[PDB]
Amino acid sequence: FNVAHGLAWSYYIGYLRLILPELQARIRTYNSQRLYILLPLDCGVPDNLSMADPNIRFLDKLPQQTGDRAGIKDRVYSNSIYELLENGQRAGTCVLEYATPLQTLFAMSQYSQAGFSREDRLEQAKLFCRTLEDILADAPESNNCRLIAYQEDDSSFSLSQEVLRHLRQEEK
């Protein structure tokens, strides 16, 4: 129906359905077991997670995954392991990243030729989350990942604490 639908399907088709089946095996080769995907509704997606929260610190790369796709021999799929600090001490570790298509929504709202307002961006970000959630709820490849959608100026927000709440909630 709209922009977000194609973006959510492309994220499943071109990425999640390919890496999620192999993820637990890659974590074993390394050794939480799931891919945590951050879904900021404002589409603010820093390339460096420590820029969002200094208590989120890069630890290691997972063993990389490569495939032939669309005529590119061995295109690389990599994921990053992060530690989450509480009072300067590690409180948890997980494979963590932002949903990259939220950057397409953000940049589209910034390019005049895309004809795409800020209101469009927020509405399409929500539709992106809803579509992706609806796809993953029925997808055979997915308890392999956890989506965290949130609406961020707000000194009361700690992204590291929020991920930690999910990690702790998951354990039980």
Residues in the chain: 172
Phi-psi sector, 71: left (phi>0), alpha (psi -120 to 50), beta: left
Work out how close the CB of 80 gets to a second copy at its nearest, in angstroms, rounded to a whole number: 5
Binding to ligand KXD by residue 10, rule CB under 6 A? yes
Residue 161 interacts with a second copy (CB under 8 A): yes or no = no
Nearest to 129 by CA among 2, 12, 4, 22: 4
The yes or no reply on residue 14 touching ligand KXD (CB under 6 A) is yes
Residue of 92, 93, 84, 87 whose CA lies nearest to 50: 84
Closest distance of CB 172 from a second copy, Å: 27
Would you say 13 or 25 has its CB closer to a second copy?
13
Choices 20-28, 49-57, 71-79, 80-88; region in contact with ligand KXD by CB under 6 A: 71-79
Residue span 39-78 as binding mask against a second copy, x where in contact by CB under 8 A, dash where not = ------xxxxx--------x--x--x--xxxxxxxxxx-x
Phi-psi region of 108 (alpha: psi -120 to 50; beta: other; left: phi over 0): alpha
- Angstrom distance (rounded) from CA 51 to CA 56: 9
Amino acid at site 68: D
Residue list for the binding site for 3',3'-c-di-GMP: 10, 15, 75-78, 100
- Residue from 37, 11, 31 nearest 144 by CA: 37
> Within 10 A of 133 (CB to CB), how many other CB atoms are there?
13
Footprint of ligand KXD (CB under 6 A):
10-11, 14-15, 18, 67-70, 72, 75-77, 97, 100-101, 103-104
Q: What are the residues binding a second copy (CB under 8 A)? A: 1-7, 9-10, 13-14, 38, 45-49, 58, 61, 64, 67-76, 78-80, 82, 96-101, 103-104, 107-108, 111, 113-114, 124, 134-135, 138
